[model samples]
Target chain A: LPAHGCRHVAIIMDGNGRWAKKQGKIRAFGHKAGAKSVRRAVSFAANNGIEALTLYAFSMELFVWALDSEVKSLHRHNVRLRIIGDTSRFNSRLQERIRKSEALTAGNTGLTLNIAANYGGRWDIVQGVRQLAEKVQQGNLQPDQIDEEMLNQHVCMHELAPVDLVIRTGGEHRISNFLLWQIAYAELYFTDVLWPDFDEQDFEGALNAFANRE
Target chain B: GCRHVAIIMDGNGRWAKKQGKIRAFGHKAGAKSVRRAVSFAANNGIEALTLYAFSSALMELFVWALDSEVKSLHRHNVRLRIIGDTSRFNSRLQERIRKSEALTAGNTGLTLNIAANYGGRWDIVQGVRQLAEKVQQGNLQPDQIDEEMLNQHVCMHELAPVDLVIRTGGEHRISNFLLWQIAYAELYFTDVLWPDFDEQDFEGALNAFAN
Candidate 1:
């Protein structure tokens, strides 16, 4: 945290497969290993002090092509999770996972952990507009009254404010599809460390870099 | 606040050559301008500012040399952004550009928007490509895109459509600077050279804006 303020941190956990590939194994090995990383990071957060943490767990495009076994593994290890997307396309199980995760983590005060699954920025906007259109059709909303505030209220991740910092691991510099609306003014930090390799020390290094930063 | 000012840092080559400077001298001077601009914008109440520092034409000419200029121009306070065909840049330039953008990702005081390796036409192309790609990916329909959609997809559309664009080096044209954004921006061009442009000159432009 800066002397001024930094409330929210978003993470794009990249290169799990690549990390596994280096060890001459299937990508599932990386996913399996990542479960440990998640547990460590979440436990660390509970011990440390941080407001909100959003992780890009999966993308909609990936879901379309991913194997069933991988999807099941994701559900089994679910901590608190929020799947932000057009839920209509998702099968019932995924929807149930969203509900169950929300219910399970509803009591966790350690941190407001958001795990984004099957999400994209454009999808968020489309959903926001669709909700507005419905409201307008019902005479509960007016086209003239639609504004950023209204749109924000309708987005799936409306509960969270704009991202203050975005940390992308594995040396990627782009935002990709993560939190585009909320990251309008986000401070970005990129590291060469792979996502699985990320630890408390690596996080601290990023924090230190940001602390001394202009 | 520097609400939305457009800059053309002219005379950099002259500034460099005068000191028996390599081309790097011009880049170094430009980097100084960026640092000063970032500080000034933060000090002011300006929420959004755009800097026209480099474009595609320059990249075509300088190639790898542009990477050095990009590195020197990096600042952590301002959200570094490039509003052009980012895919075309060389790997090294891309890495530096990405690093700079990431470093300043969360700045809240004032948004320092650097229009690096950018051009108005290229911006349009990219914007349209964004729309087109969405359509091809079955995410968006081509006909659904309108002026508003275009604005949403455009790079600087994230900011308030440019309220005012100031060019200091006596340039008369918009020169593709926020070509899509300055739909109604007040233009203030001065006869003064960019390096000598001072607060008073800015005030004079503001006074003109006020009237």
Candidate 2:
């Protein structure tokens, strides 16, 4: 075997809308329930000795929501918070809150939690390439310097460990443009359990699957 | 809902081994499934179908299949094209591919692209190499080489980007197939082996896409 467990775990928290529809409620209500699963997953990863946990938590319209009300509690538990993706499109207050949340939990030593808001994998690569192009324009870098590693440095969550396991809950098998370059070699685990209902047991099942992969 | 569909037809060898047969037997059987899939795509109004038939490691096996199928495919109004590094194939096989592609160039029905000797990384590197060459010749500047430029140079650049990607035979990995094109694709995975993949399995994937 290669190692004991997945150091970096990425999740696509899907099916909030479908979950809400099943309950005859709005999607936001379903998301509120999904937030509980986020807590469960975070604690599960922290307890399991995972170094990094990246969650695809928000799409474009839902980017402004706060999971930060529980951030102070997470900070107490030593989970560092960081938000990736383009935040310029987000409202000023929400952007400020994101910055504050990251700053507050910057010193934590447990797990690095990455919450991707308004993120698309293509957008990430496009923006990263844009930076490289800008560097070339300024005569600071050459085209040959824009190798895979150099481009990777500009992508979101560059400092974190590469994704080892990608778990997509809610029956979808797609990555949905989440961390494309990073998870190239990662083992994928898909489950039909809706995001709100995804528990520690489900997470354990995914981890077991990863451990058994060739 | 998709104009272009990409597939990673995985698990043929394992499926064949399960039945106590050689790996080549599975590929031969998979060719029948390919014919069914193409007919379905043409009938279903799918504009383009890209199949990852063989990776870079297995060139001769794919060449054998292509040599037989090209004329039959052309007769069905299906434009058959193989996208990959053709230089890796022997001169005779390469010549055969060129002729087959030319024969079907006039066809206007569903375009069937068979990816042989193709790796997503290899496609990207070749694209980058072309861009670097352009920069060296002063035809393009380093700052001008953005995603669009890279996209233009990548294989299947003329075709629409993949909308749905399906992998059969219980595998959940993409395994270095069409990484750039499938950036936004809705992936569907099935336990159905390639040789056994029928219309019902294809319908299931379509239904999943609808959902």
Considering every candidate listed, which one attains the maximal TM-score? 2
Residue B73 lDDT in candidate 2: 82
Please report, in order, the local distance difference test score of every candidate based on alpha carbons: 0.60, 0.80
In model 1, which runs have C-alpha deviations exceeding 4 angstroms? A1-5, A58-80, B1-211
Candidate 1 per-residue lDDT, tens place, B1-211, comes to 3366556555555556766878776676666765666566566666776777522655554445444444444443456566655676777667766776776667655666766666654564455545554554556643465557866767777775666667655434444455555544555656665545556666676565565
Question: What TM value does model 1 have?
Answer: 0.50
Docking quality (DockQ) of candidate 2: 0.34
User: What's the lDDT for residue B164 in model 1?
Assistant: 67
Query: Positional deviation of B133 in candidate 2, in angstroms?
Result: 6.3
Tens digits of lDDT, candidate 1, A1-214:
5342555667888878888999998987887676567656665554455566777763144343442443344345443445555577678986675576566656555566676766666556555555555554455644446555665677666776556666778764445555655654455577778778989887766655545542
In terms of DockQ, which candidate is strongest?
2
Residues B79-143, model 2: lDDT tens digits: 88888777767887898888888999889899898887777756765666566556656677666
